[model samples]
Target: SGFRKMAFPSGKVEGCMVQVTCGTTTLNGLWLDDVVYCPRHVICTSEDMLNPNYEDLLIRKSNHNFLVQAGNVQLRVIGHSMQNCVLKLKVDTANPKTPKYKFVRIQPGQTFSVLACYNGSPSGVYQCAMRPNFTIKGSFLNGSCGSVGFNIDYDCVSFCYMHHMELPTGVHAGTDLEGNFYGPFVDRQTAQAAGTDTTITVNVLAWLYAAVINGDRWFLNRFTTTLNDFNLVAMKYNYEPLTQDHVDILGPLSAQTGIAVLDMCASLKELLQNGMNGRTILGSALLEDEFTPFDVVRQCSGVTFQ
Candidate 1:
């Protein structure tokens, strides 16, 4: 299949909370999850209208100095004071000679929405402004004029913060395997105070997956840090989770690191001491099943979330 969609229904929202998918196998050396594609603005408060951060750009006003999206299409004024005021969009995305511009007399609270590429917006730093007369000193409109038409959607995450590797605030996130929703909570203490027992789970495979496949330096560094931590914990118990042969097969993990390759290495050591067949525990290895191999195997290969 091209993509398999995993949807999480939301208690917070009326529609599905999230719908993301992963490809079964690489297509032309690309995994579907390699890049994250998402919606623009998902959280905008009354406070944001009067004062916009960079997120104001993703609101479907990327290329222009000051614009908002209308129905995921055209760009409108953030908060134009004019009702059917004559305005012209002087955009930077135009050729210098041609100087492309969109003119509209927008009613209050309406947008120039419906421009196609308006979906992804434009460069983070570009100037867009609207005015009836370019020479007019005071009639110009900019973000300082404020934004409008903001409605928060709990199920959606904005690409604004996510691009910088920050999770959005004030949304229901951190779900279980079953996609059970919990904690729009700001912190662990806050969640516990609300009587919800919280557990932290990491997407460790994504880190290792990119490291192995794309050799991303940041992700690779993170994987090494994780391996270092794992070694520290296993060394405390004087546990060795790898043999030279296993190390040779698994490569780096086979190295004499303290990290426990198996989830319960001590238990496997015990099973080895007892021996599976007529073989001596010390003289030969236990059945591979004695150790959880999938724990290590899934890292190098991708796994479907669902």
Candidate 2:
């Protein structure tokens, strides 16, 4: 199956959400985001979509009262795309340890964002959830040098923070990392023909790309600590988490797999070293089995690595 997609997409890492109550105001720039739960192979294509007319899309026309809910929820916004966009996302998993009433949200002809996490739940029917929200009448205008992380004017930030959407849409970077690793970059087709780490093949660039888009160096910083821990876990047994009393209860009594888990962790680290993390085409108890590379990409090659 093709990878599942978010009502939107953004950088990977962490989970959270926030409510904005700044009355009504035009947002200079809006953050684009989504969620990823359980795990899926993702193949994403982005179009230049800032504002689109939903009158001709597959989304349900919802004018009545509406409230978003937990995972596998449906959302469609046809012809939606992001060009020269900035993605800011936070996942809210109902504390993850206890995910309830968690999920992503989407409506049409408006701005939307999602936040999510799978509760790290080691179960089939793994409980996943989100908090969905959208912007009905805000604007996305680019200024000379004033924005979320780089705005010199703190007052301006407080003024437009109302546009910040906190959500956990169901989606993640990408996971179809292995197989015939071949795709387009800068209009060029590149392939992991030899022994390129499948982790890097799947998400390394995507994660760094995500971090780049968000101005978040998660592609660099703590990736080290995070990967190190994952590697340690990989050295152990995948079923070990389940062996503990904490996991056995939450996991499906009949469903417990680790080789799959170990590969993913190793792969995640592979993407991190290559600059992607939280991305999956699946690997790796990922990073554990892989090695980090090139320190960090503090800058880009005037390319859309994110």
Candidate 3:
């Protein structure tokens, strides 16, 4: 079941492209598709990062200056003797400075007051900077420095924006689904831009996949974003015949010399009908196929995400 180990070939790198090597495969999760990130910086470059408008934090008596993680956040004095340390946490959730929001305070040794409800706008990222006010205490490092890190539900706003738009009624989150939240299908609106809603989404999906999957820089270069292209999306034509007989995964594609393609591409026609122009969909129901077991399923519960 294992092939002789072959090291990855030197990749064609351009534009700061970093190749991440996949080391191991586990049965628990779907293995690597591309050993690289979805998009560089994509992890943090979310709406909360980009918008910075709708998000804010409101610190009440329920709020405190420190963040307490799952483990005991040890508090240590960095520069000197640990004595007379007056570490006061002031939470400014009413207004955030950066694009992020957070509650403040030195991370108390494994302790923080719990919050009952998040007030104010969703807080943006909390930037904790250290201020040496107390603790000539032997100068050991523990707990968070002044305004160094945030005690934030990282996915709070994201989950909020999402659930407000997508999740069906009656079905709960968090407790019921183990904090599961499906996509905020806002792009469906884009698909239905043709006024209906159908394959527009799928059509958009297929060609987009084709460009990157096939590595057709030329195709991507010529990609048009307006409605004309939207209605008449084109598939790769002039590149080279992609015949199965010689479709090559590692090599450039051409008709005669390429290796055979084993996987079938999604039909452009099918996707074209699934988006906005595709059709008007009504009613909401869960399909048996929609359930992915193994993962906990909590319905109608409060929501959270990682």
Candidate 4:
């Protein structure tokens, strides 16, 4: 009986061992024994894995950094400078009540790279499912055949408001906080021109009042509340019903006829604040114009509009 042993060169983390047995070792027996070392694994929490900030023992990508919408995300796990190492992944099942975990085993030669979308379906090397508006945690098990240990967590924000892209293209449109749509412009340039054209500035003011009445906080804040200075030039004109004109030249003239209209600016500011009621505005409707007059009134008059 005779046997031969062979040792391969040591790899970074994985190496092979081989043993050859002769026929005399057993009855009609000739066997080869092969063994392999554990693989050196690396995990990346984001697509930009090479960035040192994205690599860590406990990796997390916060929801605030991500868009407020469900979308695809990337995660990577691969054997470094080695081959044929099993990967084990454990993830939360996303069950809030009586939480449970699920395990996925990835065989050698297959990398555990994941591109998961928040679509409520299992995908990628770990076959993990993602849910919108929920935080999911997962880990690679080092106990399973010398794999490295690390934890990963990510948050998915569900789309809550109407996205601008969803609006009809080739036109300027936006939704207020109350979900009311406002638009009559063929494009943003048209809206900007309407806002700036002195003759039609009254019409723009009417549009703004409509927007404010309907809870367009973005418009109210930018045009009225957050100005360093406010003037009463625009408020010097008053339009009847304040919400029904895309073009009007007579309204501004009618109000300028010695009607004690200078104080109307103060009244308008109070009306805007009464409508706000502690609500904040965000985003924009693509309106471009300088309301420096209104800003001057807000800045100097001891009038506060939240």
Task: Assess each prediction's global lDDT (C-alpha) against the native.
Answer: 0.22, 0.22, 0.18, 0.22
Residue 122, model 1, lDDT: 19
RMSD of each: 21.6, 21.4, 22.3, 26.6
Per residue, candidate 3 scores C-alpha lDDT tens digits across 1-306 of 111111111111111112111112000000011111111111111333333221121111122222211112211211111111111222222111122322233311111111111111111221111111111111112111111111223321101100111122222111001111122222111221111111112212222333333332221221224323333432322111222222232123212112211211223223333443432211112101111111011111112110
Give per-model TM-scores. Answer: 0.18, 0.17, 0.19, 0.16
lDDT tens string, model 4, 75-148?
A: 12121112222112212121122111122322111111122211212122221111111111122221121211
Residue pairs clashing, model 4: 229-295, 229-296, 230-293, 230-294, 230-295, 230-296, 230-297, 231-293, 231-294
TM-score of 4: 0.16
Ranking by TM-score: 3, 1, 2, 4
lDDT of 2 by residue, 1-306 (tens): 111222212121111122111112112211133421111011111241233322332133231111122233322222222111111212332224221221222111111222222221111111111111111222222110111111111112111111122112212111111111112111112221221111222122232233333343332332222434664543343211112222222122112221122233454444434643355332223322111111112222323223
lDDT of 4 at 163: 10
Candidate 2 yields a Cα-based lDDT of 0.22
lDDT (Cα, 0-100) at 293 in candidate 1: 24
Number of clashes in every candidate structure?
13, 50, 70, 9
Model 4 residue 126 lDDT score: 25
